[PDB]
C-alpha cells in the first residue's frame, strides 16, 4: 500500500532528475544554428508510375534492396510483387487471412513476410525449386495483431505486435529468440538502424523506445509526442530518427542528445501522420497524412517545401528507394504511385 | 534479351488472368463485422447464423462472411479501422444483463462517430429478451436504478408487440431502442444507417434479417451514385 507510493515517489524523482539533465544538455536550438544554411527551394515531384491491380485498401509496402522490385499488401488478401520499371506484376501471392496489416521484403530478395489480425507472421519463399510461392514458415506466439515486421537477414526477423511487445524470431527454428517488453500500448511501427544492432519502436503510449537487438534491453525512451505514434524512421546515419503521431505533428529525436530537436507542424494540419521516411541525404522528410496528401519537409529548416497530391483516399504507406531514386506511396484507394 | 522481357509480359498476363477470377469472387461475397459487447450471447448468435474467427453462411445464393475478433486486447481504436469497408457491423447488446448497457451505449457512440466508420452501417441486435421479460416481471432490478429517465417514458404508438409479453417489457425494450436511436439520430456528420432488431436465443430467423438489412444498405449505396 504505502510501499507502492514510495516506488511512485522514487519514479517521479528519477523523472525529474532525467528532465533536469536533459535541460542541462540543451544549450542551443537546432532552429538557431541552421538559420544560415540555404533553403532547398521547392520540390516538384510528379507521378511517374501508377500500379493497379489491388481490390481493397493497401496497408503495407516495401522496396527491395535492388531498388527495382516492390511489394504491397492489400486487405482483399493479396501480396503483390511488382516490377516498378516496367509496371509488370512479378508475383501475386494469396494469403490465408484477408486482414494483413504489414509486409516486408528480405534484403536478399528471397523471402517475403506478412502478418495481420491473425497474430501470425507468415514467411514465403520466392525462389522455390521451379515451383510456386509457398508459405515457408508461420511464426506464432504473439497475443495481439501484428503491426510491423522487418528482416535482419534471411534467418532473423523482428516483429511489433498489438500486445505491447516486440519479438526477435529465428525463422529456421521457429520460436522467439528475444522479447522486448516495456511499452504500455500497441506497438505500431518499428525501424531498423543502418547497422543491425539497434532499432526504435513507437507505440500508442505516445513514447518511442530504443532497443538493442543482441542484448535485448531498452536503452532510451523518448516522450515528446502527446498522442499515439503511427510512424517511425531512422535518419540515414543512425544517430537520430523521426516520428509521426495523431497530434498532427512530426518530430525529430536524437540518440546521443537523448531529446527532440525539431517539430514539424502547421496550423491547417489537424490530421495525423500515417507514415514518415527520409531521403538518401536526410535533408527531406516525407510524411503521409489522413487528408489524402503527402508533405515534404526541410528536415533542417523545418519549413515545408512540397506537396504530393495524387491519392483519393487516406495515404497509408510511403517509402523511399534505397538509392533515393523514387518515392512509392500507397493509399486506401487501392493504388500505388511512384513519384520522382 | 527481349525474350526475358516477353517472358515477364507472359507472367504478368497469367497473373492478371488469375486476378480477374479472384476479382469476380471478391465482389460476390459480403463481409460483416460481428462486434458484440461481451457476455451478450454473440457466441449463441454465431451458433445460429486464433486472432480472428470467421463464419460463412449463405442466404438466397448470396454468401456472407462474418468475422469475430478473438485474441485481441480491450483497446480497439487501432485494429477497428480495418473494418471501414465492411458492409455492416452487427452490434449485439445484452438488453437484460447490465452497467453493461451504458458500456454498450458508449461503444456504439464511439463507433457511430468515428471518422473512418462514418459511412459504415450498424445492424443492432438487442439480445436477451427472455431474461429481460422475466426480470421486468420479477422486478429484481429496475432500469430506473441505472437510467432515471426510464420513468416518465411513454411507449410509442407504432410497432405492436407480440401478445404474450407484459406491456412493461415492451416499455423497457423500446426505451433501450430509443436510447440507441438517440445516438444514431443526432450526429448527422457522415452517411450511414442503423437497423435495430429484437433477437433471442430461441430465435431462428436472424439470417433473413441480416439479408434484408444488407439488401437495403446496398440499395441505398447504389442510390447515391445518381446524385452528384
Amino acid at each position, epitope marked *: 500500500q504505502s510501499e507502492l507510493d514510495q516506488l*511512485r515517489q522514487e519514479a517521479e524523482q528519477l*523523472k525529474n532528475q532525467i528532465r533536469d539533465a536533459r535541460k542541462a544538455c540543451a544549450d542551443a536550438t537546432l532552429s538557431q544554428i541552421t538559420n544560415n544554411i540555404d533553403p532547398v527551394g521547392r520540390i516538384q515531384m510528379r507521378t511517374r508510375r501508377t500500379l493497379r491491380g489491388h481490390l481493397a485498401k493497401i496497408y503495407a509496402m516495401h522496396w527491395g534492396t535492388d531498388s527495382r522490385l516492390l511489394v504491397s499488401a492489400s486487405q482483399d488478401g493479396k501480396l503483390i510483387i511488382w516490377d516498378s520499371y516496367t509496371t509488370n506484376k512479378v508475383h501475386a501471392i494469396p494469403l490465408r487471412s484477408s486482414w494483413v496489416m504489414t509486409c516486408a521484403y528480405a534484403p536478399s530478395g528471397n523471402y517475403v513476410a506478412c502478418g495481420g489480425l491473425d497474430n501470425i507472421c507468415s514467411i514465403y519463399n520466392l525462389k522455390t525449386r521451379e515451383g510456386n510461392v509457398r508459405v515457408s514458415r508461420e511464426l506464432a506466439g504473439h497475443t495481439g495483431y501484428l503491426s510491423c515486421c522487418r528482416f535482419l537477414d534471411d534467418n532473423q526477423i523482428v516483429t511489433s505486435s498489438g500486445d505491447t511487445t516486440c519479438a526477435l524470431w529465428d525463422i529456421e527454428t521457429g520460436q522467439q529468440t528475444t522479447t522486448f517488453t516495456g511499452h*504500455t*500500448g500497441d506497438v505500431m511501427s518499428l525501424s531498423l538502424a543502418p547497422d543491425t544492432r539497434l532499432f526504435v519502436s513507437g507505440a*500508442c*503510449d*505516445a513514447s518511442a523506445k530504443l532497443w538493442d537487438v543482441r542484448e535485448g534491453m531498452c536503452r532510451q525512451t523518448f*516522450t515528446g509526442h*502527446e*498522442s*499515439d505514434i503511427n510512424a517511425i524512421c531512422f535518419f540515414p546515419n543512425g544517430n537520430a530518427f523521426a516520428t509521426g503521431s*495523431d*497530434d*498532427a505533428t512530426c518530430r525529430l529525436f536524437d540518440l546521443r542528445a537523448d531529446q527532440e530537436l525539431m517539430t514539424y507542424s502547421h496550423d491547417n494540419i*489537424i490530421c*495525423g501522420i500515417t507514415s514518415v521516411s527520409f531521403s538518401k541525404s536526410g535533408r527531406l522528410l516525407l510524411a503521409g497524412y489522413d487528408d489524402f496528401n503527402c508533405n515534404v519537409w526541410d528536415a533542417l529548416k523545418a519549413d515545408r517545401a512540397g506537396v504530393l497530391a495524387g491519392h483519393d483516399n487516406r495515404v497509408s504507406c510511403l517509402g523511399v528507394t534505397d538509392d533515393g531514386m523514387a518515392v512509392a506511396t500507397g493509399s486506401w484507394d487501392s493504388f500505388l504511385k511512384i513519384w520522382n | 534479351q527481349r525474350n526475358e522481357e516477353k517472358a515477364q509480359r507472359e507472367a504478368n498476363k497469367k497473373i492478371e488472368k488469375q486476378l480477374q477470377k479472384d476479382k469476380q469472387v471478391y465482389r460476390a461475397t459480403h463481409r460483416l463485422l460481428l462486434l458484440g459487447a461481451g457476455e451478450s450471447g454473440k457466441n449463441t448468435i454465431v451458433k445460429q447464423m486464433s486472432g480472428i474467427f470467421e463464419t460463412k453462411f449463405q442466404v438466397d445464393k448470396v454468401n456472407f462472411h462474418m468475422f469475430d475478433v478473438g485474441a485481441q*486486447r*480491450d*483497446e*480497439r*481504436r487501432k485494429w*477497428i479501422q480495418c473494418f471501414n469497408d465492411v458492409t455492416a457491423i452487427i452490434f449485439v447488446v445484452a438488453s437484460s444483463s447490465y*452497467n453493461r448497457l*451504458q*458500456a454498450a451505449l*458508449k461503444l456504439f*457512440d*464511439s*463507433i*457511430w*462517430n*468515428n*471518422k473512418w466508420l462514418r459511412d459504415t452501417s450498424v445492424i443492432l441486435f438487442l439480445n436477451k429478451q427472455d431474461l429481460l421479460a422475466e426480470k421486468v416481471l420479477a422486478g429484481k432490478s429496475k432500469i430506473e436504478d*441505472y*437510467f*432515471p*429517465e426510464f420513468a416518465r417514458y411513454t411507449t410509442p404508438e407504432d410497432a405492436t408487440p407480440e401478445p404474450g409479453e407484459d406491456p412493461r417489457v415492451t416499455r423497457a425494450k423500446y426505451f433501450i431502442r430509443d436510447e440507441f436511436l438517440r445516438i444514431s439520430t443526432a*450526429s448527422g*456528420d457522415g452517411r450511414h444507417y442503423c437497423y435495430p432488431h429484437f433477437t433471442c436465443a430461441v430465435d431462428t430467423e436472424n439470417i433473413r434479417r441480416v439479408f434484408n438489412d444488407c439488401r437495403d444498405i446496398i440499395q441505398r449505396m447504389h442510390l447515391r451514385q445518381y446524385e452528384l
Partner: nanobody
Amino acid sequence: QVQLQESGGGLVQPGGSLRLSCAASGFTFSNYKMNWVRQAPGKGLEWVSDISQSGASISYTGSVKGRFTISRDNAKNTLYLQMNSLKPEDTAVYYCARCPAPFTRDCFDVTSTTYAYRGQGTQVTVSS
C-alpha cells in the same frame, strides 16, 4: 510526457459534498475531450462523465445525473468534478481520462484497465 494528476479525494459522510480536480500537463488541454471514470472495489472501470473541448457538450451516466457536475477551465488546463449528495454506493477510485486523439468526437478506450492517458486516481470513500 502526458501527465494527469488528480486531487481532492477523501472520506465523506453520506450526503456530503466533494470537488475533485485534475491538472494536466504535456498536451494542449483545449483540443481534447475530457472524461471522469471510476472503479468500484471489486468491479471494473466504468464511465462517469465527460465534457467536450469548449464545455458546451456535457454528458453524465444515469447513476450520477442530477448530483454531479463536471467543468473545465482552459485558462489553467484544469478539470473539475463537483460531487453533491454522495451516497455509500459512490465509494470508488476516480480517474481523469483524456480522449485518445485531438479534435475528434469519439473516445474509444478510456476504460480499458491499461489506458495510457489516464491518471492515478483518488480514493473517494463514503461511510459513517
